[PDB]
């Protein structure tokens, strides 16, 4: 279906413990494929997906220098925002940035992203037209006037319209067997009696990719969404994800409850029972 | 690939 490539950034200042901590990661859909950490012994853009390891040395030399400059620029911004908000140099503060682009099934650009945050709240964001900004407070408006004068949005628009979609298509083809080959979930139902008159039916969904999944319970064909305990989708540790849904059922009426699993890796939705 | 942009706040 639709695909996306996003880069996350986090700079956390540590006044007295040296230079601020800087960690940036890159994702294609739900797959981490590059990472950079300033606390590493050798700060370099490192691969995290076997399909990205086929890029030459000029690729990793470029992304390393771009991440190092991003780290140093955020260090200047951490000191800059201290004067914008009149904050002491003793406290720790966070700077976050995220940019990327979404593409449709035809590979064409669907939406480009670029937005920053400070201490967990929105700061300044590139609007959907790629030609304007949205500032959150008066401090971000100072940044907005600087970026408009320096014409920063013109470079962002060029990247989101060109380099972001072109290199995203390259990753989707070079990792076609993992980025475009969905992994269906392994499904099974467990039984857990609480009392002598009620039990718990937990519908398990394990080892699926991408993370987008829909777990629904049906009692004689009616959705039990009000009484369904649903947990957040969680990473298994091997690029796959997990999720389960449990409903408290009275003892003796287990076969009257059915689980329904929706996933793009399934050509047909799967209905399971306690067995 | 990553965005090449130096835009101080």
């Amino acid at each position, epitope marked *: 279906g639709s695909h996306s490539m996003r880069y996350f950034h986090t700079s956390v200042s540590r006044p007295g413990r040296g230079e601020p901590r800087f960690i940036t990661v890159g994702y294609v859909d739900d797959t981490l494929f590059v990472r950079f950490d300033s606390d590493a012994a050798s700060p370099r853009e490192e691969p995290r997906a076997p399909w990205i390891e086929q890029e030459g040395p000029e690729y990793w030399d470029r992304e390393t220098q771009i991440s190092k400059a991003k780290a140093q620029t955020d260090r200047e911004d951490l000191r800059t925002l201290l004067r914008y908000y009149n904050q002491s140099e003793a406290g720790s503060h966070t700077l976050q940035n995220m940019y990327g682009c979404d593409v449709g099934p035809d590979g064409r650009l669907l939406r480009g992203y670029h937005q920053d945050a400070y201490d967990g709240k929105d700061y300044i964001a590139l609007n959907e037209d790629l030609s304007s900004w949205t500032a959150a407070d008066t401090a971000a408006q100072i940044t907005q006037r600087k970026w408009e004068a320096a014409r920063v949005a013109e470079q962002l628009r060029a990247y989101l319209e060109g380099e972001c979609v072109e290199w995203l298509r390259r990753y989707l083809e070079n990792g076609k067997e993992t980025l475009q080959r969905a992994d269906p979930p392994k499904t099974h139902v467990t039984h857990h009696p609480i009392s002598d008159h009620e039990a718990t039916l937990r519908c398990w969904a394990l080892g699926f990719y991408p993370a987008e999944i829909t777990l629904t319970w049906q009692r004689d064909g009616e959705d039990q969404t009000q009484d369904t305990e649903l947990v957040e989708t969680r990473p298994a540790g091997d690029r796959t994800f997990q999720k389960w849904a449990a409903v408290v059922v009275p003892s003796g009426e287990e076969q009257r409850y059915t689980c329904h699993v929706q996933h793009e890796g399934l050509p047909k939705p799967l209905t399971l029972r306690w067995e | 690939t990553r965005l090449a942009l*130096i835009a101080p706040k």
Partner: T-cell receptor
Amino acid sequence: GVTQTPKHLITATGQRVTLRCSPRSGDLSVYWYQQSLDQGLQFLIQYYNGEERAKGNILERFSAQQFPDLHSELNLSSLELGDSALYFCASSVGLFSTDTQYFGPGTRLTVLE
Amino acid sequence: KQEVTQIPAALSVPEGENLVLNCSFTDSAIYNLQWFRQDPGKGLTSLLLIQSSQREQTSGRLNASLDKSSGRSTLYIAASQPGDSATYLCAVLSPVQETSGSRLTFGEGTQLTVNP
């Protein structure tokens, strides 16, 4: 725009000279360049708000600094014949990679024995 | 490692014809590419600034292209006038491995003489 002082400078070897520059009103970063016959335009050093930002293959006998009034001075000490070149000073609003630098008229230095 | 080369070194053409100035750089990791003109006695004047992800820029009779994958740049001058006679310099903003910040890397330049 950018102003550089002096305009020309003719001195002997082993001497020491000072080149002054004044960036544009509102410019916070200053740049120094060297244009000779055997190397073309070459980057030397860059300052931003009185602090060193970037540095090229600059010799230890070349000293530069930026003052709180944002003007810069470049000390060329122990001059040699090869130091004869055209030294430019440029400035920018800040460190934005999407903007441009503005160059001054330059200072022409000729070192004789 | 970042090196910029401009060809040719000199170009004398009659008045009115179109012109093609070439520029190449080694390290494709750039932040922007600029074209300057240098008049003797004066400094450098910025003609065109191409962003990193852009492919072309236009201002008046000037058009410049950028291809980072090939590391080339071309400046097109349509209907050359005698007033265009200057040394056209090709500059690149790019970092260097294991240094503080990024800087400009200039080429040797193309001495253009538009004879009237």
